[PDB]
């Protein structure tokens, strides 16, 4: 928490456009028409094994090419 | 006529009266056209260029409770043009992670009926 005191404070004593991107930017949502509100990537392991119904590309890992 | 376009989405949303004509009018057309190139001719049209990934390939990523059907049709139109070695036996050859051949995924999508 501490820390998290003196990020959210130096972020808003930045006064700059703020270049430094956090994330993946209006990467796709699931919808026709939809493709806004950018994202964020993390990984799960090892238990509980099923059939993949939900997903969104054809397995890569990063961006393809 | 984009054939390519309409036998993916007919494999990837279930539907099997769709795949068929999408079927026979590829036998149509591969009957037109018996020069020189009657296997090469109906991989092409089934196998993508870009990645390799075939129509099976296509088939079994994403799984849906048609997929077993969908999988005994398509395999014996290769059984009837005599191509089901290189189709089956067909390799993603994107470079960048590719060898994953169409048995690879049926174990990893875990079809112990379809293997």
């Known amino acids: 928490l501490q820390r998290a005191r ?8 930045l006064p700059e456009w703020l270049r430094s991107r956090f994330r993946m930017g209006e990467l796709c949502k699931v919808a026709d028409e939809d493709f806004r509100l950018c994202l964020r990537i993390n990984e799960v392991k090892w238990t509980e094994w099923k059939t993949h119904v939900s997903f969104l590309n054809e397995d890569p890992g990063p961006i393809r090419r | ?17 769709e795949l068929r004509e999408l ?11 018996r020069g020189l190139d009657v296997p090469d001719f109906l991989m092409h049209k089934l196998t993508a260029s870009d990645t390799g990934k075939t129509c099976l390939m296509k088939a079994l990523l994403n799984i849906n409770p048609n997929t077993k059907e969908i999988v005994r049709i398509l395999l014996a139109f290769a059984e009837e043009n005599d191509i089901l070695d290189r189709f089956i036996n067909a390799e993603y050859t994107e470079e960048a992670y590719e060898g994953q051949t169409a048995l690879n995924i049926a174990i990893e999508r875990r079809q112990g009926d379809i293997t």
């Open chain 1, 6 to 13: 003196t990020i959210l404070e130096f972020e808003k004593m």
């Open chain 2, 23 to 33: 079927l026979q009018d590829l036998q149509d057309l591969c009957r037109r056209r």
């Open chain 2, 1 to 17: 006529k984009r054939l390519k376009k309409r036998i993916f989405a007919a494999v990837s949303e279930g539907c099997v009266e």
